[PDB]
Amino acid sequence: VRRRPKDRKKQILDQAVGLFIERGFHSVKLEDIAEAAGVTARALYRHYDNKQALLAEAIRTGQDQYQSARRPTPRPLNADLEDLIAAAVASRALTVLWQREARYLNEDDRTAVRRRINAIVAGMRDSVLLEVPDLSPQHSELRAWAVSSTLTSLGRHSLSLPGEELKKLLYQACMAAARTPPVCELPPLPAAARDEADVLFSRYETLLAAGARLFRAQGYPAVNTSEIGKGAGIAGPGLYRSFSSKQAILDALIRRLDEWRCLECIRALRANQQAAQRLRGLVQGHVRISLDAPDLVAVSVTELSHASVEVRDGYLRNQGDREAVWIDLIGKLVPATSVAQGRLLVAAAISFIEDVARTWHLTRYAGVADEISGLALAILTSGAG
Amino acid sequence: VRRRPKDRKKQILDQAVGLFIERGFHSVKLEDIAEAAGVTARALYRHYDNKQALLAEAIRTGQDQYQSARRPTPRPLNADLEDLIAAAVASRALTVLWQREARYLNEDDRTAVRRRINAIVAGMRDSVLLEVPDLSPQHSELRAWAVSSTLTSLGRHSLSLPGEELKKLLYQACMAAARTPPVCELPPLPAAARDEADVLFSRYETLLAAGARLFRAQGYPAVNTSEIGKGAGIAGPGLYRSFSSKQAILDALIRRLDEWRCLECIRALRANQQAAQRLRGLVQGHVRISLDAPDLVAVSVTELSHASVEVRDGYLRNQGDREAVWIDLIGKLVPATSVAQGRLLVAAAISFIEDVARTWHLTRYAGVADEISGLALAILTSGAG
DNA sequence: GCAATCGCGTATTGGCTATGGACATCAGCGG
DNA sequence: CCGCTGATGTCCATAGCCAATACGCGATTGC
DNA sequence: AATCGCGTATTGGCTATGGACATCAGCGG
DNA sequence: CCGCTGATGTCCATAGCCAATACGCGATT
């Protein structure tokens, strides 16, 4: 009656990849993967030793799929862009494997996936430097990260364009980002922790900072209450003296980020009245907030699925309203850009800003915020052609 | 058995004053006052036309009590500060009568109460100008408001000092505030509504602004969902497509103000490391937030009793932590001041900033924020002598 | 092309609390 | 001591208001 | 001079899931 | 009809989230 397909491992791996993409590593039970393949958990143990081994196999398979879709001597970015775009469109879902799921692996696998990502970014940087021969290494790295984040932003949503419109949009955005002239010399800053200790002036602030750091480093389901308490110097019952629960801490982080973004948007709107100056002010405020609180940005990017329904819905609605304001300004500045193209460009720019803000070594230069804002504005305005 | 004291209306008025001070005018029923006076509700109608007449009588009685406590040619502030301080210490619980309960009266009674308050402030300004005869009208008005707000702050909490320490503290604070040299000139601002309209970029923002304005103008129990919907341009039931309930708007306003204050405090802490500059930066951030959002300040001052328990508790705890940071800085700068004196001075400065921020005609000058910050710092630092 | 959403006026609806009429009782006074 | 007209308490009910949630009606958008 | 909540460190559950013996087919000779 | 490969039954171990109880405070009425 029941037959062994002799390819059980491939089916189990495919189901695990799908479930990890959809719901996450901790929220997907082994029996869920087994049922998706019409087996039980002990069959998976017959095929894989551990659940973590299954996750590592899934992440490696996703990276191999991206590499195969990518399909030697470095060539100008204009020559390689079409291939890069095709690969990106085909692999849009799998971004979370390396970006979020890989967070849960052991040190060796994390180092391996980090090496793969760094090699990809280095190839993109080589292409960018071949496109513009006269560029400082920091500027070349920034433009390479801009191109990479623009290509990777497709995995943060489900929007698309009919026909070859999406490819044209991505090509224009990447080429405009790459060919942006430098705005400052970008000198390395002398190289903080004292300011970080000073800004934790209460037990509530210390617990909030410890929770945000632990959520960014490990993940919400993987952080104990005792870990947050130790970060604050107490036990978990101390955290429950200060908070109602850990979901309360997550909701507090999300609400704090939302309110800060709203305040910066209000200030930017009140400061300027013309379209260009207003868009520049909004981009500058977003960059400022992203650079000042990388942990909040990382939490909002990753752990949003574990927050309360009302908090998540409100945060998403407010972000959508601010993005709609951005799209209206973009459409005013560039009449050719439509609304779908506008939101695609806005998502790409936001992804670039957030990705650069989280990386530490990219933000160790004087006046890097101006460069980030200029690159984001170039990406947003690339719709002109 | 039952006895009619023939002075029943005086006891009814006393109980009404006590209940109006303790809790809101809308939060006490006529049955509560009647029970406190040992009578039934219609017995009150035998002595008063309605509840609004009783409220007006209570407010007039409180103002008359303050006037009697105070008791010609104006005298220098140093020769009248003893009397004013005594009057304030005696009338501290009565202040809310002409500050919150006044909004529920008729137009004529509101104008009469405003006239009484303005006459008191004008007498204070005359005393201040007699003390320092080298001040422009704007500076004299600002210093008079500083003194009046210091006394009103003393009439805002339950803190006190043993013996004549409180009188000495208030005298020093008022004299330091009055004797502050002008920080800068105050040219009248050329005279927006355009900035008040574009910042409402979504239905949620419009509803929030309308709710805040209505709560400030009338009070939380006196505003129904119909007015908020009309301010947003929709029907009353349409408000629930964006909010869970009417209390959700108040909770959102309180949370927004708390997060904005927290962000400004964090920025001020990170900007400066020395004690004096750090305290100046904290005061400047508080002044900036108070001046930019007067409606939020008014809501937090008045309608806080109608918010959720958790939201109110969190807001109070965060404000207490920030004020504790202020008190630590004050104690570092001035070794003489103790913790309780620091609490009193911080309350005085905060009340001064909030009172000046809410008044519209006082803020129509160029660089008034610097003068407000200077006066607040003069109040806070006072205590060296 | 058509069904699933989506705002948006209206329409109820279950408290809830100022008022209020009918009736009742103390107050001191004038024989 | 005792009626005897003021003034001053109760007892129970009613009317209007005000969250908050039902409908139905249109217009739009994914399939 | 009692009297008090205020933190603080264990303490004890209740509940999910990951992993695992024992039995179990199937699938090529 | 047989020896290897895969599967299915329950089952237990153990971690993690909230309460609950314990003494000291150090300030409060």
Residue numbers in the entry:
A (entry chain A), B (entry chain D): 8 to 78, 86 to 205, 208 to 401
Task: Show sentences the authors wrote.
Among these, a notable TFR in Mtb is Mce3R, which is encoded by a gene located upstream of the virulence-associated yrbE3A (mce3) operon and represses genes within the Mce3R regulon. In contrast to a typical TFR gene, the mce3R gene is a fusion of two distinct TFR sequences that encode a double-TFR polypeptide. The genes encoded within the Mce3R regulon play key roles in lipid metabolism, resistance to oxidative stress, and persistence within the host. Additionally, mce3R is encoded in the Mce3R regulon and is thus autoregulated. Here, we report the first three-dimensional structure of a double TFR repressor that folds as an asymmetric Ω and engages with the DNA major groove of an equally asymmetric operator sequence.
The final map for the Mce3R/Probe A complex was reconstructed to a resolution of 2.51 Å. The cryo-EM structure of Mce3R/Probe A revealed that the Mce3R dimer binds to two identical duplexes of DNA. The M1M2 TFR monomer forms a C2-symmetric homodimer, and each protomer binds an oligonucleotide duplex. In agreement with the dissociation constants measured by EMSA, Mce3R is bound to the 27-bp region (region 3) of the Probe A duplex. There is no electron density for regions 1 and 2 in the model. Each 392-amino acid Mce3R monomer is folded into 21 α-helices (α1-α21), and each monomer adopts an omega, Ω, shaped TTR-family fold. A four-helix bundle formed from α-helices α8, α9, α19, and α21 forms the apex of the Ω. One arm of the Ω is formed by M1 and the other arm by M2, resulting in an asymmetric TFR assembly. Thus, the four-helix bundle at the core is assembled from the same protomer, unlike typical TFRs in which each protomer contributes two identical helices. The two nonidentical HTHs from each TFR bind within the high-affinity, nonpalindromic operator motif, with Arg53 and Lys262 inserted into the major groove.
